[PDB]
Amino acid sequence: TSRTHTSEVHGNAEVHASFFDIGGSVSAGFSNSNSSTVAIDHSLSLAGE
Amino acid sequence: NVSPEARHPLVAAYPIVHVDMENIILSKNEDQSTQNTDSQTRTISKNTS
């Protein structure tokens, strides 16, 4: 069993070029998570010597 | 064989014996062993998740 908690920061900046249109889209982002990681693993083997 | 010096009633006839060592062969009582061993294996497994 496991419980992932992935967080994050960000910082972005974009400008679009047009004829009479201009604008700067400067950004920053953050997104956490509350996960649940679980697994059931089976195995057989056969060691002949 | 009584030597002719001692063939007079006044001279005694008798042996003088002694032992002398000429070699000494000492031999260390000790045992060895050797060994040679092979081995082969096959492992066939399974794993789901």
As a whole number of angstroms, the distance between CA B45 and CA A42 comes to 10
Radius of gyration for chain A, computed over Cα atoms and rounded to the nearest angstrom = 24
From A42, A47, A49, residue closest to B48, measured CB to CB: A42
Q: Tell me, what amino acid is at A9?
A: V
Which residues of chain A does B40 touch, with a Cβ-Cβ cutoff of 8 Å?
49
Resolution (angstroms) stands at 3.4
DSSP of B6-21:
G-STTS----------
Residue B44 has which token pair?
């066939």
- The C-alpha of B39 sits at a distance from chain A's nearest C-alpha, in angstroms, of 7
- Measure Cα distances from A36 to A4, A5, A31, A39, B5 in Å: 6, 9, 17, 10, 123
Tell me if A41 and B39 make a contact (CB, 8 A cut-off): no
Question: How far is the C-alpha of B25 from the C-alpha of B31, rounded, in Å?
Answer: 18
> Determination technique for this PDB entry?
cryo-EM
Structure tokens at B22: 């000429």
Q: Which residue in A49, A40, A31, A28 sits closest to A2, CA to CA?
A: A40
What is the Cα–Cα distance from B46 to B49, expressed in whole angstroms?
10
Residue among B29, B38, B14 at smallest CA distance from A49: B38
